[model samples]
Target: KVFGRCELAAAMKRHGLDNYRGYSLGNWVCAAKFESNFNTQATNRNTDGSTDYGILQINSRWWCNDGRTPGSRNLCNIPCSALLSSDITASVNCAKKIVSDGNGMNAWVAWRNRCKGTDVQAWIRGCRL
Candidate 1:
């Protein structure tokens, strides 16, 4: 399901990501827009036979099980399906783990390509947060 930007902001705050790992709320929201357009069920097949799952587009290569692929590190110790819910707690926790491992939001390519070092305030332009 696609969430409104404000809803996403509120959820990020509730999940303790508003200022997580030195990244701002706008960075997360902007990356989410580029990565999945706020769609929790979003998935994409990468060229390496890996899949990106959920709104954060977490990769099957290292994070979650796609249920058919083998040898996944599943570092988040979760199923990819667990990330595809409107309730974003699982996804948020996984993302935080990823960031804590040192990538920060750079764990997300969308952040590197779209949100990193960019003026991302517009991502929350009309939101009340």
Candidate 2:
């Protein structure tokens, strides 16, 4: 199925301000739109063949400890993972968190303006006011 910005925005709206609590749903919706184009099935592989799974594009190399090496486990230390476990929620939350510090909105707008990309931070900051 294909999703346009309005459809995606409606979906994120269900989560609501109660979902964001303090931040902007517009930003989060924007981020998710960018990251996976609101497609849940999205996945990507790195040059090394490491995989980014689901909409969040989480590197299984980092989250699942699915990678081959020991130090790879250290990847879990990324701040974004604290908000969620699965890819969808984590991806949404990670996008929110990138600019959770306040600067993400401008950065996301810039990225979108420059590259026509969404990814994580773009989604989060795009939600901002």
Candidate 3:
């Protein structure tokens, strides 16, 4: 669980996600809000037999390793558990790589569905960054 949006924003900033890479803070904030509600330990098992990890919900199929999902691409080469931490450095790093690889924030389904073409200003509104 997270304290609130401000806390998540602060954490994101500390981890180099405050408009790091090619995206804006609002984009990151919007994705995080829908992905895991800022819960660092959040995990969701998908019907496709893969799991999503951490706040950005990095998928085991491409980004990280999951014991249950053998032969995972593990493109980030980091353990999935690294993402499920109060410290989100690993999560942000992998997410940056994922975005840079090609699809940008559209790599995240939540970003495509919810954040795309929307006014996400309210996501970081009043945050003293």
Candidate 4:
């Protein structure tokens, strides 16, 4: 499922992204916009042989087990395929853990380059939360 801009913002907020780890809702919403353009089935493979899964593009090397990355820690203890479903609970929960693990939002380069230090409100502008 692909989420509309405001639709995803509200969903992430409901999942507790708002003010999580000192990051505003817009920060997370902005990152999602750039990371996967709100598509739940989005996936990407990295040059390092790790695959990123789902809307936030959670990586298999350290987060989820894709069965392709040999040294994956599987810190989230979930199969990488779970992140591709419309039930974003797995993706959301993993992302929370990612930040809580001391990595911060900088774990995603898309967030750092596009959402970080920018006027993030622009990403959530028309939304009510």
Candidate 5:
């Protein structure tokens, strides 16, 4: 079962949700749903049986393997599990930082802004975890 919106918000706080400079919970939630459908246990497989797993659909091999932490140019090196295990807050914060760095959730925000018409405050009102 999916968590409630309030539960998700609390989870976000675990990883510095307040650090969002110009964004809101709604913005994050909207982006998250678009990414993983708010399905924390979700997983997808690569051709080799390696998996993209968890709430943010984090790919274990892609983001955490081969020293992809900070300065690596793997581009997909955004390791969510490293911050906090199965922690939604950490994952959300990671995404937020990505947006701040101009990657915009690797262009996920473009989909939110354009296709979904996501408004920060508006998203907050409709929030569902």
Candidate 6:
């Protein structure tokens, strides 16, 4: 599922991403937009022998178990297939673990290269969340 911007906002907020780890939900909005264009099925295989899964692009190296990553930690205790669903709960929960584990949103390079220090207000503009 490719999310409409505000639809993704509402979904993420429902899972408590608003202000999670002191980052605005808008920051998350920005990350998702750039990470996978909010497409639930987006997956990327890295040249470094890891795969990034789902909308937020959580990596197989340390997050989800993809078996093929060669060094997956399965830190989220979830299969990579679960991250490919229209329901983003697993992806969101894994994201929480990423930040709480101190990776910060910096774990996603798209967030840093695009969203970091940029005002992401447009992502949530006019949404009454």
Judged by lDDT relative to the true structure, which candidate is superior, 4 or 5? Answer: 4
**Which segments of model 5 are wrong by more than 4 Å?**
18-21, 46-51, 59-62, 66-86, 109-116, 126-129
TM-score preference between candidates 1 and 6, better one: 6
Residue-wise lDDT of candidate 2 within 1-129, one digit each (tens)? 345555555555554432463445555555455555666566665676665544444555445444343454433444323323333444454445444545644534433653334343344333333
Better of 4 and 6 by lDDT: 6
Model 1: colliding residue pairs: none
Model 1 lDDT tens row, 7-70: 9988988899988998888998998899999999999989878898888998988889887666
Measured with C-alpha atoms, the lDDT of residue 14 in candidate 6 is 99
The positional error of residue 98 in candidate 1, measured at the CA in angstroms, is 0.9
Off by over 4 Å in 2: 1-23, 65-70, 74-129
For candidate 5, lDDT tens digit of each residue in 1-129? Answer: 265655666576556654375556666555556556666766666565445545555554434333433342323454434433455654564455456666554545334554344455554564353
Write one digit per residue (lDDT tens) for candidate 6, span 1-129.
999999999999999999999989899999999999999999999998998889999999998988888756999999999999999999999999998877788888999999999988878998978
lDDT of 2: 0.48
- Tell me the lDDT of model 1 at 55: 82
**What are the per-model C-alpha RMSD values against the true structure?**
1.1, 7.2, 1.4, 1.0, 5.3, 0.8
Ranking by TM-score: 6, 4, 1, 3, 5, 2
lDDT of 3 at 16: 79
By lDDT, the better pick of 3 and 6 is 6
Per-residue lDDT for 87 in model 3? 80
- In order, the Cα lDDT scores of the candidates are 0.88, 0.48, 0.86, 0.89, 0.52, 0.93
Residue pairs that clash (backbone atoms under 3 angstroms), model 5: none
lDDT of 1 at 77: 93
In candidate 4, which residue ranges exceed 4 Å CA deviation?
Answer: none
What's model 5's overall lDDT?
0.52
RMSD from true fold, candidate 6: 0.8
Measured with C-alpha atoms, the lDDT of residue 84 in candidate 1 is 93
